């Protein structure tokens, strides 16, 4: 199993950590808890050329929490630059993040992602987004919330890193599940948790699913 270092950069609040957490656990984190320096998370995808592992270096976007800053970029083999289509400032900062990034990583595949395209009042419109053209970056509109194009950045990078343009994600194998008998020595806490779970409302009851 070959692994690749991925660095994720962009302004604070653009959705970098949310995007990564969606891919790690399936969840949608609604709160904004600013990253401090960097959080490193392994992320594997199964493909028709075997598993590919990304070591995702999810960096801080707030200057005051920047930590090592460009120090995080050393030996990155790919990157994602993130901005927020509801915040023009975050797009105007894309050339700055790109500059800092390519000075350390001169020849890596890079995806530019405009996040939050689910929001109706969009400020950075499709026709304004052209910075990727001269810099040879792939671009995708994404949303961590609706999951629109959420797999594309990793899929494109995997194709570039492996050097195979017909690479596809594939259904991971499904091992037969066990038949674990319930043990009353932790039943009380298991049914304490169940009744609490029943009386906690599910989030986003107005969604389609």
């Amino acid at each position: 199993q070959v692994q690749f270092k991925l660095v994720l950069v962009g302004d604070g609040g653009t959705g970098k950590t949310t995007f990564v957490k969606r891919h790690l656990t399936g969840e949608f984190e609604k709160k904004y808890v600013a990253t401090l320096g960097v959080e490193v998370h392994p992320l594997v995808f199964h493909t028709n050329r075997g598993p590919i592992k990304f070591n995702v270096w999810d960096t801080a976007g707030q200057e005051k929490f920047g930590g090592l800053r460009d120090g995080y970029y050393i030996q990155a083999q790919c990157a994602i630059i993130m901005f927020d289509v509801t915040s023009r400032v975050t797009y105007k900062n894309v050339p700055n993040w790109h500059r800092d990034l390519v000075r350390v990583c001169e020849n890596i595949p890079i995806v530019l992602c405009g996040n939050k395209v689910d929001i109706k009042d969009r400020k950075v419109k499709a026709k304004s987004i052209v910075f990727h053209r001269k810099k040879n970056l792939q671009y995708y509109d994404i949303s961590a919330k609706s999951n629109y194009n959420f797999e594309k950045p990793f899929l494109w990078l995997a194709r570039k890193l492996i050097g195979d343009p017909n690479l596809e994600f594939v259904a991971m194998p499904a091992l037969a599940p066990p038949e674990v008998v319930m043990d009353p020595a932790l039943a009380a806490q298991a049914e304490h948790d169940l009744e609490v779970a029943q009386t906690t409302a599910l989030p986003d009851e107005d969604d389609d699913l």
């Binding site: 499904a174 091992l175 037969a176 599940p177 599910l202």
Partner: protein, 121 residues
């Protein structure tokens, strides 16, 4: 999955309850499938996420389990599971599963129970 029969397929969103955080966290959206192993006649829930196709549910539909309503929803079930192997080593979870419709949720409950009767034999 190719020595298993698809007894039932439905589009759904799966949650797990985080006890420390006290909040429901989404785990995956996609086709929830009931798969009956043709050799053992044992029916499992298998569910994969859209696009990545990563497993978000993989457990036997145990006879002991009971689907229960969630206070917020007419189109969801909550139940305890003692051994799911989606993310690898067997863990226990309190799952919730939401469907697009109350009729889908009712249909799911019928099928979940029929699969339970099958697993008793």
């Amino acid at each position: 999955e190719e020595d298993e029969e698809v007894l039932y397929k439905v589009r759904a969103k799966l949650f797990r309850f985080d006890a420390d955080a006290k909040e429901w966290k989404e785990r995956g959206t996609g086709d929830c499938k009931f798969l009956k192993n043709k050799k053992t006649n044992k029916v499992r829930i298998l569910m994969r996420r859209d696009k990545t196709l990563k497993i978000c549910a993989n457990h036997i539909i145990a006879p002991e389990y009971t689907l229960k309503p969630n206070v917020g929803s007419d189109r969801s079930w909550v139940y305890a599971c003692t051994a799911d192997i989606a993310e690898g080593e067997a863990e226990a979870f309190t799952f919730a599963i939401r469907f697009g419709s109350k009729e889908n949720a009712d249909k799911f409950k019928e099928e979940f129970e029929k699969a339970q009767e099958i697993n008793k034999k």
